[PDB]
Amino acid sequence: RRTTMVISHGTLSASAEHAAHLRQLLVHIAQATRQEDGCLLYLVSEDLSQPGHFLITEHWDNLGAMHTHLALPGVTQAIDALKHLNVTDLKITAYEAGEAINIMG
Template sequence: MAGKGVSLVIAGTIRVPADRLEAVRPHMLAMLKASRAEDGCLEYAYAEDVAEPGLIRVFEAWRDQGALDAHFTTPHLAAWRAVWPEFGVSDRRLIAYEVASERAV
């Protein structure tokens, strides 16, 4: 996250019934590919929790609030959210963190 100003990290979880995870995977991959191509997207990832099947860990990093705001208006985000009922996606818990600096640990 090089550069001046405040970047944003979004971290949290969503849930998918474990038996629906393979069926929803193509929709998740489409969302990842399109989001990663957006101007201002620094990182965009989903990962299944190894201890809790169906718990999807979400991690995003955005250049700034403007890039995140633009993300919220994209057709691929609307399409992703539109399939949630079909696949039982629920319990969205995402938090935005403002990052003023970074360092390796």
């Protein structure tokens, strides 16, 4: 249950004008990013309670891996692609996970 894993939780929304494009963009971003060093999970999803509101769920092996992702080129570029779709509410917060606890399954 000891872990160095880092969790990132991101949310964003788009209007109906841009959301289809956003869905595709998020899928593209996920496909690429999952192949980065230490990326254990990069899931893009849509809130079942709130159409047009999206989640970006990431698990990184350790802080260093997440840092590499944040520091290597392409982050600003992806953010700008989101801004191009008039996304103004991107929030991303990460956390070091101190223990990993199986609840079920």
